[PDB]
Design a protein around this ligand. Sequence first.
Ligand SMILES: Nc1ncnc2c1ncn2[C@@H]1O[C@H](CSCC[C@H](N)C(=O)O)[C@@H](O)[C@H]1O
Ligand code: SF4
Length: 418
Amino acid sequence: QIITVSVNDLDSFGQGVARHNGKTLFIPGLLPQENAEVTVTEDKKQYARAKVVRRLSDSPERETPRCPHFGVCGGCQQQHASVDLQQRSKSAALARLMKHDVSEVIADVPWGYRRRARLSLNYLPKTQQLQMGFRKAGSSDIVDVKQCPILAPQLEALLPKVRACLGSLQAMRHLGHVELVQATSGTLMILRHTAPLSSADREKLERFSHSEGLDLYLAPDSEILETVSGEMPWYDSNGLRLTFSPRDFIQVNAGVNQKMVARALEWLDVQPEDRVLDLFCGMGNFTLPLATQAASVVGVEGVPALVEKGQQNARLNGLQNVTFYHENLEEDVTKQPWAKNGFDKVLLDPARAGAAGVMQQIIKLEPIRIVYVSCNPATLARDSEALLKAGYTIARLAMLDMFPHTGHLESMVLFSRV
RNA sequence: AGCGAAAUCCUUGUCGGGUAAGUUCCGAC
Ligand SMILES: Nc1ncnc2c1ncn2[C@@H]1O[C@H](CSCC[C@H](N)C(=O)O)[C@@H](O)[C@H]1O
Ligand code: SF4
């Protein structure tokens, strides 16, 4: 029942991998070249999961986890693995998936990197107390979070303050979550709440926000966003200042984001006469930097508020050579406006679900280079196949360490055709 | 419970394809 084991791989999701009786065995908390006693939790046909009883060897890449909630909070998977081991294992997963070796790692600071976080809240009726933190993996339980060394320093320092303020509210039984974003322009807080705030609660939140120099936003439902304090927010992408929608997507690691965008642009080698297409463009994180180089740029995005922020960004920065279209890129895309006109370069940066609907249309546009940014390598590999059967070839492949200590990886690929 | 869920965490199940007896991909109930 207690079984013996020697780990010789770290998957990209942060668990050690061993074999027992031929069967793959996934063990959280074990590093390559560690030996241990373990026992089996989930035992499927083709693989088993297991947890350590006695670790019997230490890897030289083993680290002492920095966060006291590591192992309970579900947010980090591999604080125990050196940054070097993480990058080596993530880029090995990416190479295998893409059948190509990884020609570069793009990285920034290993701690204090996260500029956008969503904390869950729950009132504990037993005690008089508000829970604020992140979920246990695979669970709805909240771990109370006192520190979080992956959060940007200005956000981590806000944690005891936000907890204190929110727990003094009358509406405290009725809070859904709190979003924290650290932009270049300043720090924003969005309180999602499921019943109205009395004017007393509001006064406390306004005072708290001014005290801490936060922009405060209230979301009483899915369709409303009340601005209580602050100016239009913005971040610096490649020396441009870009506004964004506070509840909606921006890249979560500022330092890696800068490096990604600048590298993407170098890879696309944008000529002053190039017509450029940027799919899944959000608020124009890549599109506007492309616009400073290209004759013409076309952005395509599904969320209305992100399309309109892209537009506002072009206007704000005096860029007249860029258009943004609101389309669902999983519908019949041949009937869509962007689909009917030529392009020299294509960049896409889709959600975890990837870009299955668009690959064939990208092929008919006949671009000379394609840069595909992905936060999910199994879907990149899936979509990539179609480019390769169409006679594109992988010219460069980068692993981007956007999410240190998690089991997630960013990547970017350059495809060029014959 | 409630919140969120074209998402760092934020969990239905069973079975199948793919895969490294490999979790991510894909499909059915
Ligand atoms: N079916 C779909 N149609 C159009 N847009 C979609 C889509 N599914 C996801 N998206 C968009 O794809 C984007 C991925 S996030 C990346 C956004 C932008 N490139 C940036 O760097 O900030 C999101 O903005 C999301 O709304
Ligand atoms: S997400 Fe934050 S609180 Fe959770 S384990 Fe990671 S550093 Fe700790």
